[PDB]
Amino acid sequence: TINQMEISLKEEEIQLNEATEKTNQLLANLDKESKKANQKGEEVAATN
């Protein structure tokens, strides 16, 4: 039983780290895209 619960914790923790890395990098990419979008929208509002 000790081995079983250890294995489950190990695999679920590494999967959690993978999914959290996925969640993090997407947020940074989205923040960069949002900064560019807001600057270009201000430029468009100016131009119109």
């Binding site: 914790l9 923790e13 999914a19 996925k22 969640t23 990419n29 979008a37 430029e43 468009v44």
Partner: protein, 48 residues
């Protein structure tokens, strides 16, 4: 003005796609979190 507005937008569409992928991601990650909970205390109590 209209052309520059449309060009600046595309970013919003990509943001929405990324946000939906994010949606499924944190739902699945919360499921994996609650699974990965309840076994850490199990391993601690088992080894005690």
């Amino acid at each position: 003005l209209e052309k520059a507005r449309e060009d600046l937008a595309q970013i919003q569409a990509y943001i929405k796609n990324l946000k939906d992928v994010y949606t499924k991601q944190m739902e699945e990650k919360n499921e994996l979190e609650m699974k990965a909970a309840k076994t850490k205390k199990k391993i601690n109590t088992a080894r005690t």
